[PDB]
Design a protein around this ligand. Sequence first.
Ligand SMILES: Nc1ncnc2c1ncn2[C@@H]1O[C@H](COP(=O)(O)OP(=O)(O)OP(=O)(O)O)[C@@H](O)[C@H]1O
Ligand SMILES: [Fe+3]
Ligand SMILES: [Fe+3]
Length: 899
Amino acid sequence: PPLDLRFWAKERGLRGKTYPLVCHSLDAAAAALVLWNEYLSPGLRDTIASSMETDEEHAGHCIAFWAGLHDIGKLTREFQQQIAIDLSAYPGEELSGEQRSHAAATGKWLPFALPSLGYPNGGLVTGLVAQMLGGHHGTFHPHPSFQSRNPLAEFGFSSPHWEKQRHALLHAVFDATGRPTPPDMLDGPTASVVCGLVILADWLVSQEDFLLERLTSLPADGSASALRAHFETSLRRIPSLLDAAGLRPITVPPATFTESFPHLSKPNGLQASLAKHLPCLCTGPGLVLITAPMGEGKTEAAYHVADLLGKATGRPGRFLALPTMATADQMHTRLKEYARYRVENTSSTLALLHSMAWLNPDYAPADPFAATDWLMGRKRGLLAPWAVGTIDQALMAVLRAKHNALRLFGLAGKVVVVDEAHAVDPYMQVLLEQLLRWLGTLDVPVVLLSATLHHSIANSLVKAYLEGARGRRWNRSEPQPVSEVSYPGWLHVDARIGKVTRSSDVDPLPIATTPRKPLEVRLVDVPVKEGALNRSTVLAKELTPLVKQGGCAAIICTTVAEAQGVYDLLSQWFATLGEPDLYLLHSRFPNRQRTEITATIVDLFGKEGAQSGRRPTRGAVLVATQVVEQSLDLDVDLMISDLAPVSLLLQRAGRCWRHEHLGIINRPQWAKQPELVVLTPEQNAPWFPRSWTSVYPLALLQRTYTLLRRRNGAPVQIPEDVQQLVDDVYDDDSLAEDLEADMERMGEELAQRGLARNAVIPDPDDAEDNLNGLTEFSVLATRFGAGSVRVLCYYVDTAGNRWLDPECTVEFPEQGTGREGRFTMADCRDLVARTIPVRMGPWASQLTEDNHPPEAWRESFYLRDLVLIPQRVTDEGAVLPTETGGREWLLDPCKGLIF
DNA sequence: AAAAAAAAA
Ligand SMILES: Nc1ncnc2c1ncn2[C@@H]1O[C@H](COP(=O)(O)OP(=O)(O)OP(=O)(O)O)[C@@H](O)[C@H]1O
Ligand SMILES: [Fe+3]
Ligand SMILES: [Fe+3]
């Protein structure tokens, strides 16, 4: 029949005009086709068409055709009546009162009209294909159940009229994408990825510019050719939409190590053995597990590994996963330059992905690889050709929430690399395994970078990759894929056969790293007052040789109020000198402050301060919480930690003479050997302050302590005794002599790993025929725990007006400085910098209205959920600690927040 | 009682 163009698909923002539903549908079908050819990785396209068991011109045409049917659900009365419309020639199909999403309806009508064209009635293919189109807005719906023999009617689709036009529309786009015949196979994992494709497509033709332009040349009627005109017009315009979005693939030409990295003069022992023995092993899709110490160039190795795996799997896309927004920021630069160096001269962006990437002004817009607008959008990030972000951005592809199959699509065409794997806790590990699981089944090649990593984990990781690859999980009988991990050393995994080639099997060197002097480890007992450590005594003793001959020392404390006491203690102790330098650094400083301290600190004690002689010849001490453990270019002559689990101590203590080998540092006399003094309480099973049992499992401290007393002051070889210490503290049972406390630890780990299984999507086997499991729940974390809120201290005079400074001269912003007083990214960036991150606890449940921000701010994503912390200021101008949610707060200039 | 991450069509 002649398909009437009165049926619309868009009304929003057209200035009273409407866009016909055929036209939106074709547009989508075009965009989906273009995508297929020009955007998707070659190796991806193959994985999909292979899983459909077909050729690609065909595969992309079926995909082209489907994607056009995504909004067919809009052809119901419930949807089209919303705006003014004359449906006098379409009686019947009266309102139900159900209010079905058009998407759902699409998923509902499709499985009983697709066989018209050749699809298996009840065929898993028809099953999957209509389910994934019905989920074209990021929620999947269950396969339609029905009791009669005429479900098209059971589901509402009952008018002969309306049903011809649904068919006309069905038929129109069938004609356009070339009447493609149904594939034989299609499964869940492929179909969710194909979902992402359709979604990206619905988005690209949904923009107002595109639409308003197409709005000037609407075909005059439903004729197969008026429509073939339009389908061809849109076919023509989509590529320029890719270019606006910075979507073109970043393609790097094959090269050696030395060619890729001209600048790097000498390859690393590790690097030489990778660049040599991997080209052969990279037969196709598979996994590389690299593991080695700090500063051993793994990033550079990684960029390379990726490229071999890149050619092997038709995958130029890049995602590099990092443990913090910080380490991501830095690495964004490292890869942007690597791209400028490597790309052939001849508009594809390179993305920064984390919550804060708007507040970076060197990234976000107001150059090739420059971030574009469109790509700045909310879930899009992972759709960029290359991209570097936090690991959380990727695990969000395997939690159960909306658009996780967009997130999957993005990850699919790329090589993916996660650094500092060792970082992840039990909760995140479980999330990762399942990502690795789903990437396994999807032919995406994977790189894992780490420092020393415990074996159980390494096993579990690659095991997950292989369970995904082959399509069946592991047996209790089946012989574990990993039994020992070598530090340093690498490891390759093949998809085709699941062969775990180690380093020791392809080459016997052993891998060369930096040579460095054995670390001293000194258990030092400490007296106890009121449950916590009084350290006054032992501090005067260990840092007396600093106050005399100079030096660089670092004191690490388990908690924040601790390292604040240990700063006061030290601070008074220099007021007596009176004429070393003294620094404090934890998580509780306003962002603005935290940065510059970090800056000063990685200048003095950093590698750039030895090379520039800026390293302080007078004594210098730093007092830190576990902030030290992440991303700090430091080097200290002496270090003194409180006990932690060994894994953390050995990384806390990687800083000591981290740049000794450069021989560009004179160490003080007293600084004989690289030393870690480790505080511990004096006893009366081993016991610890509650504040240590609170952050670390009592059992884990107790083991670590005993694992050290088992050496009696013997030194730790590096990098040779490190892996045996990380494996053993967990593995040995004989280190545990409190069993209640050591069973609590194992229970608490179950707790976390358990919660994570509840967050995650299904194992791909289980999603073989049913996508509905993917987005179904009843906000999900990428991290176990209560989390942090951000607080902003405002100051209040007795009037009391509100100020941003204790000097009460910068009025509190009731408004912004953009047009109409809206807040801006520049405005938020400024504002956010005075906010400080405070761990959720009972206090946040007792928040009065003067802790809840101005109404102007509720309209801003960054500012919306800020908690305001008042700090009263006297008439004589003094900051008093102030009541807020049942605890006294005081932002101190030199110490940070204090509650 | 640590640190760490976290409106679309
Ligand atoms: N041949 C080489 N040997 C040692 N270092 C090198 C070499 N070539 C370059 N470097 C530099 O050494 C540093 C090594 O740090 P890299 O970026 O590899 O991180 P890493 O400490 O090795 O591991 P991670 O990625 O976890 O930080 C880099 O700054 C790199 O510029
Ligand atoms: Fe839709
Ligand atoms: Fe749509």
